[PDB]
Design a protein around this ligand. Structure first.
Ligand SMILES: [Zn+2]
Ligand SMILES: [Zn+2]
Lengths: 153, 231
């Protein structure tokens, strides 16, 4: 698929819509959109291995990771494929997301379609946290909102 | 139907918990094998029942039970789930399991429906920005005319009808030989307001949508774990 979209929802006030576009085969993926109702600051932003959300993050699996790496930031070479770092919310709680990424794709073995996108509570420490949980989830805390990434027209 | 292996994660510390769990499943209609693992906190269940029912049977005996995996014995060809929902009272969970390269088990439980036949369809896009209205038309890669599950000339997304009982619950389990799990990952599953006439209504929308009225609920067909893939 050439485009994709995700509608992030949660229990709290956090909600958002995220678009994906990939015009080149295995090319960069434009990730743009907006999330509102966040606290001001950096919020972890990750793609999970599965899109099953029948039991929350349990059924969602760990961070999408077909190359069995440890957690890093988007610009790190040692990263999970689903590691898209932090989005930044403004004083009004609005994070305007604008990202380019070539490790994720909308086709092939890094295809993120069918998988859960999550916006997290705290800042993702980008694998540099000095303890085991930093190499797994990046210590971003609990799930504020999520949705399945689907195919768009 | 075909046998399906369900991998449940069930909490059970004592040996008395293992005995309660095994008793609730063993000797029940449509449950071949049970295979409890105390060390791994796991219960494999070979069955022809819906997963929603086998989950209720486990949960009915005290301890909680989450479904973590789905296959058909020993290579996982593809598993998926669609959580139905939106603005109305309709909500449910439908699971897809690719049994063989040419056969797919679709199985689910849906509540909040008016008693009677409701059409069920895989639509082409998984775009929920305008809820079900943004999901596009019935998934039709072959450029076919609309039909029912029995018609070989049908849209690949055509799953016919689903009967809601007097309590508004609609349980079903079916195998489809044209729909493939990884052909529909990221697309949407939609349940409709009324009956799918299966192309046979003589109405302008009969050969397009089956004239089943408004879309009530819909979800994106998401990737889920096969057996032992999510620990
Ligand atoms: Zn990660
Ligand atoms: Zn159709």
């Amino acid at each position: 698929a050439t485009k994709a979209v995700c509608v992030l929802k949660g229990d709290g006030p956090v909600q958002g819509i995220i678009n994906f576009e990939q015009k080149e085969s295995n090319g960069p993926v434009k990730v743009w959109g907006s999330i509102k109702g966040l606290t001001e600051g950096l919020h972890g932003f990750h793609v999970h291995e599965f899109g099953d959300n029948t039991a929350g993050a349990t059924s969602a699996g760990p961070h999408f990771n077909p190359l069995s790496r440890k957690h890093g930031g988007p610009k790190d070479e040692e990263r999970h494929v689903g590691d898209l770092g932090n989005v930044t919310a403004d004083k009004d709680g609005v994070a305007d997301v604008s990202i380019e990424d070539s490790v994720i794709s909308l086709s092939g073995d890094h295809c993120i379609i069918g998988r859960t996108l999550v916006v997290h509570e705290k800042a993702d420490d980008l694998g540099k946290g000095g303890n085991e949980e930093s190499t797994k989830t990046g210590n971003a805390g609990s799930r504020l909102a999520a949705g399945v990434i689907g195919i768009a027209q | 139907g075909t046998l399906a292996t369900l991998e449940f994660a069930v909490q059970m510390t004592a040996q008395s918990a293992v005995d309660a769990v095994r008793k609730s499943l063993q000797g029940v209609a449509g449950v071949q094998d049970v295979e409890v693992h105390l060390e791994d906190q796991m219960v494999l269940v070979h069955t022809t029942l819906p997963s929603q029912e086998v989950q209720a049977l486990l949960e009915g005996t005290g301890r909680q039970a989450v479904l973590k995996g789905m296959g058909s014995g020993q290579q996982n060809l593809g598993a998926a789930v669609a959580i139905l929902g939106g603005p109305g009272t309709v909500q449910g969970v439908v699971r897809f399991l690719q049994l063989t390269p040419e056969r797919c088990l679709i199985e689910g439980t849906i509540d909040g429906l008016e008693p009677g036949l409701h059409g069920l369809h895989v639509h082409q896009y998984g775009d929920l920005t305008n809820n079900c209205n943004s999901c596009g038309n019935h998934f039709n890669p072959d450029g076919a005319s609309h039909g029912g599950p029995q018609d070989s000339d049908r849209h690949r997304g055509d799953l016919g009808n689903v009967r809601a009982d007097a309590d508004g619950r609609a349980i079903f389990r079916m195998e489809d030989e044209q729909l493939k799990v990884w052909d529909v990952i990221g697309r949407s599953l939609i349940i409709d307001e009324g009956e799918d006439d299966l192309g046979r209504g003589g109405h302008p929308l009969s050969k397009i949508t089956g004239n089943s009225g408004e879309r009530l609920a819909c979800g994106i067909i998401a990737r889920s774990a096969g057996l032992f893939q999510n620990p």
